[PDB]
């Protein structure tokens, strides 16, 4: 275990920060920790990204910015306006993936229909 600061610094200065973290995880690297876990009833909508925590019984809720590689690396977000979908919001992570919220949000996409993670919560 090399530490959050070491992993984030290594990814932050890579030309592709997302690829750097994914390659690190694929090599057996310990996931980034110290994400902000929320106290909640697990009775929520189960939508992926929300104004308040919305974990259902299959999810954990976290502070959005703490689970965002770009926020955690202090670098620009990969879109023209550099907007963050996670900052100031709460992200619902499947309990099976909640050991690596940064990796989960990086690798996954929200169903534009039901607002749940494609391949997980989404049953469209
Ligand atoms: C060992 C220790 C630190 C690092 C590093 C930190 N930021 C970039 N590389 C790389 C290997
Ligand atoms: C503490 C209490 C309950 C839970 C939980 C319930 N369903 C998923 N996680 C997680 C932490
Ligand atoms: Cl830390
Ligand atoms: Cl989900
Ligand atoms: Zn962000
Ligand atoms: Zn869906």
Author numbering: 7 to 130
Task: Provide the authors' original text about this structure.
One of the targets to possibly combat SARS-CoV-2 is nonstructural protein (nsp) 10, which forms a complex with two other viral nsps, nsp14 and nsp16. As nsp10 is not found in host cells, targeting nsp10 and thereby indirectly nsp14 and nsp16, provides an exclusive and targeted strategy to prevent SARS-CoV-2 replication.
VT00022 binds to two ligand binding sites on nsp10. The 1H-imidazole moiety establishes a hydrogen bond interaction with the side chain of Ser15 (∼2.8 Å) and Thr12 (∼3.0 Å) from the symmetry related molecule. In addition, there are hydrophobic interactions with Thr47 and Thr49 from the symmetry related molecule. Interestingly, one of the binding sites on nsp10 for VT00022 is located exactly in the interface between nsp14 and nsp10. These fragments could interfere with the formation of the nsp16–nsp10 complex as they are located directly in the interface, within 5–9 Å of residues Pro37, Lys38, and Phe245 of nsp16. VT00022 is a very weak binder, and although clear density is visible in the difference map (upper left), we could not determine its apparent Kd value under the experimental conditions used.
